[PDB]
Amino acid sequence: MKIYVDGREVIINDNERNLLEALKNVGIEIPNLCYLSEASIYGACRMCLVEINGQITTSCTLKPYEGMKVKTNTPEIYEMRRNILELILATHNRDCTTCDRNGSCKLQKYAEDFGIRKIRFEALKKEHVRDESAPVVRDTSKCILCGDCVRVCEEIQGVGVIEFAKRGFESVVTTAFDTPLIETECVLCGQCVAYCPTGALSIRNDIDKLIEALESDKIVIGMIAPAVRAAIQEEFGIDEDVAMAEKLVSFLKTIGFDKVFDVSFGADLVAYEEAHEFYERLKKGERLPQFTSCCPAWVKHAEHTYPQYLQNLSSVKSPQQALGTVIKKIYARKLGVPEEKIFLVSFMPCTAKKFEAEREEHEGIVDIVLTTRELAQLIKMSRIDINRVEPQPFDRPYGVSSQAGLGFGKAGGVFSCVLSVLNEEIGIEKVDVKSPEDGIRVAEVTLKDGTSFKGAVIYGLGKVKKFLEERKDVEIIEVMACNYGCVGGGGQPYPNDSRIREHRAKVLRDTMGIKSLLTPVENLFLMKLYEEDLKDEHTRHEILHTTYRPRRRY
Amino acid sequence: MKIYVDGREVIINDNERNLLEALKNVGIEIPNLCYLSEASIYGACRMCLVEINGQITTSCTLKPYEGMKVKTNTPEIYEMRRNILELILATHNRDCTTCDRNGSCKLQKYAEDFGIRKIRFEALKKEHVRDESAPVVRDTSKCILCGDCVRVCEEIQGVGVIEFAKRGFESVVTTAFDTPLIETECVLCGQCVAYCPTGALSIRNDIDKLIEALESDKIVIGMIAPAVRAAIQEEFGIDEDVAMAEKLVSFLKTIGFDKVFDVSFGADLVAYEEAHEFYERLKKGERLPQFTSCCPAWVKHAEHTYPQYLQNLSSVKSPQQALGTVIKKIYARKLGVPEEKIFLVSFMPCTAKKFEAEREEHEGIVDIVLTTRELAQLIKMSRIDINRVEPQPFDRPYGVSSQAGLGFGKAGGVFSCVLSVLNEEIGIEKVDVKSPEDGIRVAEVTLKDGTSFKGAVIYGLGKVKKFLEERKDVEIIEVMACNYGCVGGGGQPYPNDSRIREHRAKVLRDTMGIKSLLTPVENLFLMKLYEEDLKDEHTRHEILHTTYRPRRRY
Amino acid sequence: MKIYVDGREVIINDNERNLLEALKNVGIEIPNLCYLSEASIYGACRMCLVEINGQITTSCTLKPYEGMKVKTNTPEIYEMRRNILELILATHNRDCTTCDRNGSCKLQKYAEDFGIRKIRFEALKKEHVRDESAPVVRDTSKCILCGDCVRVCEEIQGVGVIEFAKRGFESVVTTAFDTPLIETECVLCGQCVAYCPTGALSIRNDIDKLIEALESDKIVIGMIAPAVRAAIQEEFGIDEDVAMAEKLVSFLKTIGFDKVFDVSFGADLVAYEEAHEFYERLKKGERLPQFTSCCPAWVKHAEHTYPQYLQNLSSVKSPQQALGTVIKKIYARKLGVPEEKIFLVSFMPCTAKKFEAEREEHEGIVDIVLTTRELAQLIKMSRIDINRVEPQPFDRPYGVSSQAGLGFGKAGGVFSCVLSVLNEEIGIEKVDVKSPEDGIRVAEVTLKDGTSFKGAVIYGLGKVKKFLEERKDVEIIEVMACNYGCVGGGGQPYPNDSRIREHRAKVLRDTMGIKSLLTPVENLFLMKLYEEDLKDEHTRHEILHTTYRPRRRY
């Protein structure tokens, strides 16, 4: 399709939604602040201005036609773009040094490139809202009111706890009545953070606490989540490698970690316990369908939204809490040191794990939760060339896991691990998987001795409401709050989009492929733990089982 | 240092051996056919001609002086270089399509670049020698008489079984009296092949036998050596990856391999058996010092050169033969299929393993041995993107190994594995390692209950003669024929030089770092094999022990 | 679209012609020898075999269907592919060292990758045809009978002087009765060479003559064509640069060229003379339409095919011959040296220029014509880093040209230059350009004082026949034998396809953009030449005008 841009012949696609996208797909970029994430919409920034027929208009809302002559760069357009950018910056909290988005901020880059060196306009005061009550931290002084977070929270996560409020100069994205986020129905999934193009939404940093713990004389123990190892190479701009976790082990020992364990061992433990709980439930037809309890965002969502299903939740705690309780109540004893001597650090891809660790039912097990980004900050701070670090394995006795346990890092992993345990105990004849829609997988399972069942994997909160409204023929339901599962967790490296998450899933799959242990029962250390310290039902319930309670405001 | 090249000011190093090297280090390349490998010398090709003071001379033998004016490209020099290249090509066997060096041949590249399209001179007949009696294959019709192989065999391998013979136009690199290589004292290390810049020395290809076996109805079993996985990425010009072996497993299953096992499991088995043999020898002070028998080139060298030490050789067979005997005499029975139904393929970095498999003491265990280059040819033939292949583990019950077993792939690995087994059974207090010279490491070992001993690791035949002439205070000696061990084996990808071998050793070390099994006794499958099928001493001797005999001509 | 390849889920395009192309577009490569150039067709090689439904078939002729399960690599397919490649090689003239396609040959690469080291079959004798009568050189011993050249010559060039002859084992691509190519109606465009995937069709190399001339005491003068500078960077795998021609000047002076002139100066001269010839013809309505005579392939084609239009041909000689005659008959005199002392080298993108230089009407003006590939061979032979060469301008007085003269290197350049000269003398009001089809541009020209005319640019012989059969309303017709003009000449670097030719045209356009002289009359040196040595009509006719004669066989 023939169009003229700045008096030059350009061929674009025959069918395109608007001029801006067509030029972008043909390699011509128009400055703009609307396209910021996968949840973006056009029309707000007004910087995409072009001149067609001697009149200036936004190219994001212009349908191309054959023979159109467009000037993308005129003195008038230059002045208008500079004015709009200056308008944004004048009332922007310009403190990039302490900003979470520093270095990966489109606004900072435009300020650099547009040669903005003095604020011509006035930094007129706005009634800014600062919120630090939750692991998700809000600071509206940096918000550019793009609305990406509102759409993510409403349409993708199905929560909608943040909305545009007020109007005009006092327009602000905020919770109802500016309530602290920790007191709302926010599930702390961090997806809004994953999509925010500024530092307005960020993750609470806890590096200072880790440094303090490392400097003292208490025993610091780290444990790395499955999905951390499949994504942390992005922070360093290097290709994946299945040896990433062992490089992390070496780095952590270098900076003074006493032990580093693999949370995928905890995933093996959780899948082994949950398979038995589910089998008992199926045998006595009680408390069905069973919901997995490994995603704390889903758990909080259920406590807010489905108080009737709280008993249907799996009573087994998540891998982080399970492994942490083992470390604190069994390993500490086996080591001869008081539990008060152990400082347990959990490296996770998830903001909701920070909330989970601080839950009343788990108080004092996990001392701090650091996300993949915080771990990357530790590495970058050291300036060590992580890619040249010699790998070494995780520490015994919680440093080995089956590929099924490592599979927890992506949606469907825990269900696959449960099926693996069931098959290894009570064989499975066949499994018929079906995909009703984009993020829903329904599998029919027939055991050797009958008693078939259906299980579903749902990734992305918000799909849950409709699925639960239309499917009563499923016995076990796995729910992951984040699309693609934990590889797309809120604490993962930014940018955190669909293509990057798919690549992370591929990395995790390749990492699982080099593992020789196929099922949790082939984990000799897990079997030894069960045989030595989790023999009776009472001890197992105390160590690996937790409770849930309804959540309401008044 | 100021010099003028083609009327241009060039600064070179103050201290340099000759003009050619100085220009090369400053980025100026002079065409030449002398620098071909790490065993090269200057003066033979005569193509490095330059004009200094109006007279033409070789730059490889010209000491630079301040203010020298050199013309590197004159019509006269052009004619002389073209004439010399045409002289080489006229009597060269020009059949690149079936040449082993096709695509990585400097002569082929020069023929392409010099625009040689017709042989002006005459392809005058030479009494060419073709030799295909050994896995190392000779074809003097391609030899450019560079002499690199003669130097490698004499000075680096200490064998010197190939030499310049005759003179003038009939000059030829050959064995004494043109004897077949298989009937000489050649140890078949393949180092000459690793250094040859043409196809004159090549490795016998056995792909057609593998295709025939795969096409039949017999069960094809593959087993991959430790050092194959640390080097095969070079053939594809991609970065290392610790997951390489599992990608190989996936590829081999794709092209119809029934099982793929890890020869490093055989390394664990061999180290476990050899540690006990050595401990018995130390206890009764008999048959010392003990020589490792894992390198077949060293074994053949000893049979030729040290008939008095043949009893001092370890009686345990090499990992290839040990694992192959297990597969043929135990696994075949456990599978319910006759041993005649199994076709056992061994993928090795070594040409001497082809000879070893065909030895009389091993006849009919290993059906074919393919080198890393042949495996790369299989992959390239398929055109499959190996880097995108999903990894999967080795097959049970011989698909797992300790890091010590995988360490066999580089010099010192078998000694380290033996020390690991001894430590796990009879603890080791300390080990004092010393390096008398470049490829010799001497370690003092003290066990818990006294009975200390010294062991040496020697890599590179030729160092052995002098070490054995000057050290009577060592109890165990590990000998690897190839410098750096098997990462620098004759069957490894070309070019095969010191820097590449060091990088391969680094890759293998990183691969060993991600392994959770530290010692052979932690290998549950190895323990189960010993407990089920290698219980009595008679069965163990029959399965894992071999004999040696003197080698002499008459 | 969901398909399974080697038991793996692959998504391909919904609408695709065959499985092979679909897999290729999805990143899966199947070995094959059918896809070799832009003139290729499927079905001949038979190496693209896949297994679908347990039966083997060619993937190039398999329409994909949803759910198809295909095995691209089975032992049976492996054997068949190896057998087919061995069948090709057995009867192939395997002399890569002296082959023109050495290093860029798909067959050589497959021989390397398939591990073919011995010809199992027999090199059964074929009645091979060797032809060296023309600058296009034929050697059927290397032909793989792909048929690409037959299609190029018939359908793209509209000549069809080469065809498949005989059948079975004696099938051969040849001229009628194996007549020498120089005695046929071949126009020597070299497009068949540009498309041939082997060395069966090559360009006659003339480097040895240049070396001989440079070594003697005669004055060697070089002149570089416009399109040589826009394409020679491909041989060195480096990005374009508008300074390429001046680097060539520096390199040529380094290897002993006395002078280097710019043939684009000759293009300015030719356009200036041809504009006046055309204006006279228009004024007296004689010998119309005028055909440009700058493309010698077109000239030979007309002499064979349109003896009635020979008077309609422009009588002005081509830029090479015009500039060469100036150098030999004017510059030699101005230099004080006999014309016999000058050796004139022409660097061209064209094989037909080699023929033109040897024409009877031009005998002894241009001593040798070397193509871009031969010039690249000179550079590579020197091993000089051409990208680091300091540029220097062309030599006076023929080293400067207008952008219009440099534009000759791509189709439409000479017409644009003629229009530029006419406009600078007799202004042009407007020009209305129209594109009846892919390689035809028709422009309406109105001068200031009326007398409008139409001119057409046709690139790619074969379009000419139909255009001349349907357009009698054009006064001037520019014909270029090669698609895109001289940037796609037969002597250009290989591969020589549409995308590469378009990129070369872009490079030439960028080179023209940095030129400050807009029209030939702004060339002060050209004006001085006309004023000093081309004053009278007789001298101008003798120096810049040539004749044509009919071509027929009997």
Ligand code: SF4
């Ligand atoms: S969002 Fe942060 S990094 Fe970007 S401009 Fe504002 S303060 Fe700077």
Ligand code: SF4
């Ligand atoms: S963390 Fe999740 S639920 Fe909470 S505001 Fe952000 S997107 Fe909404």
Ligand code: SF4
């Ligand atoms: S918080 Fe971030 S994503 Fe939400 S509107 Fe503000 S800038 Fe946009």
Ligand code: SF4
């Ligand atoms: S899906 Fe994973 S990353 Fe996302 S909230 Fe749940 S546990 Fe955290």
Ligand code: SF4
């Ligand atoms: S050594 Fe082999 S590849 Fe090199 S020129 Fe000779 S035949 Fe060709």
Ligand code: SF4
């Ligand atoms: S294989 Fe080794 S011993 Fe034999 S000729 Fe070559 S370098 Fe010498």
Ligand code: SF4
């Ligand atoms: S065999 Fe190879 S290395 Fe030895 S002299 Fe001949 S070309 Fe050189």
Ligand code: SF4
């Ligand atoms: S060192 Fe390794 S590669 Fe070299 S000969 Fe010995 S076993 Fe073979």
Ligand code: SF4
């Ligand atoms: S076409 Fe030339 S380069 Fe290709 S295989 Fe034949 S001889 Fe070798």
Ligand code: SF4
């Ligand atoms: S040079 Fe042109 S006309 Fe001659 S055979 Fe080749 S394609 Fe045909």
Ligand code: SF4
């Ligand atoms: S001459 Fe070249 S293009 Fe023509 S059929 Fe033979 S190989 Fe193919």
Ligand code: SF4
């Ligand atoms: S178009 Fe140019 S390259 Fe092609 S034949 Fe004509 S003059 Fe030669």
Ligand code: FES
């Ligand atoms: S891109 Fe933001 S308004 Fe057009």
Ligand code: FES
């Ligand atoms: S480099 Fe070979 S003789 Fe100088």
Ligand code: FES
């Ligand atoms: S690609 Fe050649 S026959 Fe299919």
